[PDB]
Amino acid sequence: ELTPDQQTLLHFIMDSYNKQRMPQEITNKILKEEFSAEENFLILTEMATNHVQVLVEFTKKLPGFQTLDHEDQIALLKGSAVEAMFLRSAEIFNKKLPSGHSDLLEERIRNSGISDEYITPMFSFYKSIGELKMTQEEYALLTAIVILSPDRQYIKDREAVEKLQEPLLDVLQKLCKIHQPENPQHFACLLGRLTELRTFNHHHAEMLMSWRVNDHKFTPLLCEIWDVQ
Amino acid sequence: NALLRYLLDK
Ligand SMILES: C/C1=C\CC[C@](C)(O)/C=C\[C@H](C(C)C)[C@@H](OC(=O)c2ccc(O)cc2)C1
Fold it and tell me: Which residues of B touch A (CB under 8 A)?
């Protein structure tokens, strides 16, 4: 029911995952700023920038991550950004906002120059994870797993990443067997939500593509992380 | 990738 070595790993991850927060200045904007498309997009840029800042801080602390080759570190970070962000933004939409602010945040996302074709599956993802009442444990481990995926483009040592990833998958699996024994399929279904996460790489690329036609601007970190040049 | 490297090391 978790070896002591698995307990340690779980505590390292949760410790690291929890010292990341959405700054108050940004959530305040969700209520206070006017509801124009220009201001909506500006706020999303700030959330995005913050998601990526938070991704990096989480990543740099992942066990074994310093031991990987420097180029691969960067391929992981960039490979994973979209999937990790959408997941985080799901936790935030479901769980780290006061009751009414989902509705407003949603209203802003709905009037920021994103096609319904990307919105529909986004909010369908948010819905489906909320109904699962996904735990903090789950968000955290799932996030670590996405980041340490051996399947990204340009990894020179896929085996070294696989050795960091496997232990995380075993922990999560055992947590499922433990905390949800009446649902033996739970682990598979969380892996199914990872499969659906992978869908957003395509969507996001399309979304960035449409914003760029209307000459919207993005920040240094964001242009860098997604090769927007 | 000088910016991402910087953020990885600091
Ligand atoms: C759709 C957005 C937010 C709600 C969450 C979502 C839908 O999962 C996706 C993406 C992020 C959120 C993390 C805030 C933001 O999307 C971006 O990636 C972005 C990048 C540069 C930019 O100038 C503006 C936005 C905006």
Answer: 1, 3-5, 7-8
